[PDB]
Design a protein around this ligand. Sequence first.
Ligand code: HEM
Ligand code: HEM
Ligand code: HEM
Ligand code: HEM
Ligand SMILES: O=C1O[C@H]([C@@H](O)CO)C(O)=C1O
Ligand SMILES: O=C1O[C@H]([C@@H](O)CO)C(O)=C1O
Ligand SMILES: O=C1O[C@H]([C@@H](O)CO)C(O)=C1O
Ligand SMILES: O=C1O[C@H]([C@@H](O)CO)C(O)=C1O
Ligand SMILES: [Zn+2]
Ligand SMILES: [Zn+2]
Lengths: 225, 225
Amino acid sequence: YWRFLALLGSALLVGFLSVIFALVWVLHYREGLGWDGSALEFNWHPVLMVTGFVFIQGIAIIVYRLPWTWKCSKLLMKSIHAGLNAVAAILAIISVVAVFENHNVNNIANMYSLHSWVGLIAVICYLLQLLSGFSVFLLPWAPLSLRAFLMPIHVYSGIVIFGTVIATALMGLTEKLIFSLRDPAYSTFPPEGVFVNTLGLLILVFGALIFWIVTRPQWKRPKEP
Amino acid sequence: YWRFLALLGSALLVGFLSVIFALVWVLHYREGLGWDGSALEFNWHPVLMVTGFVFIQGIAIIVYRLPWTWKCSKLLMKSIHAGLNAVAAILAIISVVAVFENHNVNNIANMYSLHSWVGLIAVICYLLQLLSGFSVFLLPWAPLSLRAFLMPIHVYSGIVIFGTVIATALMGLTEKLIFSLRDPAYSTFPPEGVFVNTLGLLILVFGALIFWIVTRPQWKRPKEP
Ligand code: HEM
Ligand code: HEM
Ligand code: HEM
Ligand code: HEM
Ligand SMILES: O=C1O[C@H]([C@@H](O)CO)C(O)=C1O
Ligand SMILES: O=C1O[C@H]([C@@H](O)CO)C(O)=C1O
Ligand SMILES: O=C1O[C@H]([C@@H](O)CO)C(O)=C1O
Ligand SMILES: O=C1O[C@H]([C@@H](O)CO)C(O)=C1O
Ligand SMILES: [Zn+2]
Ligand SMILES: [Zn+2]
């Protein structure tokens, strides 16, 4: 229980450092934020993605395993889980729309890269996990048998999409650093290169912590009567 | 059992398509292979990495869950598991040495990228899982209690390193396509862009299949007496 406390502690810390490093990076090293820059608008993409898709979803994934909720309502924890994932969906759609906007405005191509393919798959599958999850596990009419055999799929899919999102983030960082750090070139180890690489590792470690927490059987929410 | 057969079937298929797509890509679209090209030598990197690190390790990770081995020796299955992971280590070290060689020969920088940071971490941790795994679980002198509490770490770490390796592969593809596809630019959807993006997705799906297989409790190797 207290070693769980230390794990949730570390996960929260690394996660918040991921968001801080995202913000510091776009504000300091890049040009900033804004709703038309146009790269000012683009840099909403990494910031949103880290914030909702990696961090908020990272937390939503393990919301049920907090002990101070075990004797809380299941319908309430379903509400927190659904809603937290929902904030993360909204933010990720906003983040993808930002890129489609900066690109259509600036006459760049869409969906040519592997980062966008994987990314868009993870987004679509995230909304399918959200819709099925909401129309089976929150909603009332779904027969208990349908919950019974959707559940292992739904847990697995959640972990898979989480990982895929981490992998797409690291691909995103790479694309941005290679495109942007031309002179000083990325190869020359410039300050933004080390800073962003570190943010990468933080996003990675945070994934590792969330996976550890979420795969302890001794911290699963104790089964309902 | 037969739905397991179909899963191992699909995993093997997608895995072999990953290796085929790697080879077709470096041989067709790039310049080829060789032990001094110098990019001929480099293109050993993706090919080796896909082959040993993604595929051979993908198989080693689920070797114990094949039913036709459940009433086989545990020491034998430990041998296959160890040895398969060992082939994958050898190949991955060869693959990293290839890059350090092409780069030192051609005066490029080392370890400036996030793909190399994560990649090198995954390699070091893969050799630490290999050494600890070999000096606890194959070797005789390790007290059963030390196996008892190393095991959940060791399973977790294996799954984490597998995923990290998948993420580093996708980062690698991205780097290579962005560096190499200058004219026709990657953005222009050239044939190699679609082919390699597809190889990316195959590497991804293969990871998903291996994770599904390896997290079915009904396919864990039945515990020793
Ligand atoms: C993109 C959206 C979602 C993702 C990534 C996701 C992910 C997950 C994950 C990873 C778990 C395993 C947690 C654990 O066992 O500790 C889980 C459990 C669960 N999820 Fe979701 N989920 C999503 C949407 C939803 C929605 C909308 C609902 C609606 C009620 C829902 C209901 C549940 C339930 C009931 C559990 C079982 C909790 C337990 O007793 O351990 N999920 N989810
Ligand atoms: C991890 C979750 C992420 C997802 C799911 C995701 C998804 C996407 C999608 C669908 C696109 C295509 C948009 C378009 O074609 O206009 C895109 C573009 C892009 N993203 Fe991400 N993204 C993520 C994170 C990041 C991060 C953290 C960065 C950091 C800089 C980044 C950098 C880029 C860049 C440079 C592009 C345009 C180049 C391209 O089309 O590949 N992405 N992303
Ligand atoms: C990089 C090297 C390695 C990786 C990635 C790795 C990965 C894994 C994974 C993912 C599992 C879980 C499989 C399952 O539960 O179905 C596992 C199980 C196991 N591994 Fe390893 N392993 C490595 C090295 C070794 C070595 C050298 C040994 C030496 C004997 C070993 C011994 C075992 C044992 C005994 C099990 C339990 C099998 C069972 O009864 O289910 N591992 N390994
Ligand atoms: C997935 C497992 C992989 C691992 C663990 C890995 C690891 C590494 C390491 C440690 C380096 C640094 C070598 C040096 O600095 O000279 C490197 C470089 C490189 N790798 Fe990978 N690699 C992997 C897969 C791939 C794949 C599939 C490609 C496909 C083209 C690729 C493309 C590159 C490129 C272009 C470089 C040089 C640029 C750089 O330093 O980032 N890698 N890799
Ligand atoms: O609706 C639900 O389904 C799961 C599980 O019981 C499925 O077997 C769960 O925790 C609910 O409250
Ligand atoms: O976000 C991007 O960065 C590069 C380039 O615009 C930098 O000048 C690019 O092509 C993107 O899509
Ligand atoms: O050496 C071993 O340790 C594990 C497990 O028993 C640990 O509890 C296993 O399968 C062995 O043969
Ligand atoms: O493997 C590589 O591809 C590019 C470049 O060499 C292509 O001309 C680069 O810098 C690498 O390290
Ligand atoms: Zn852009
Ligand atoms: Zn090179």
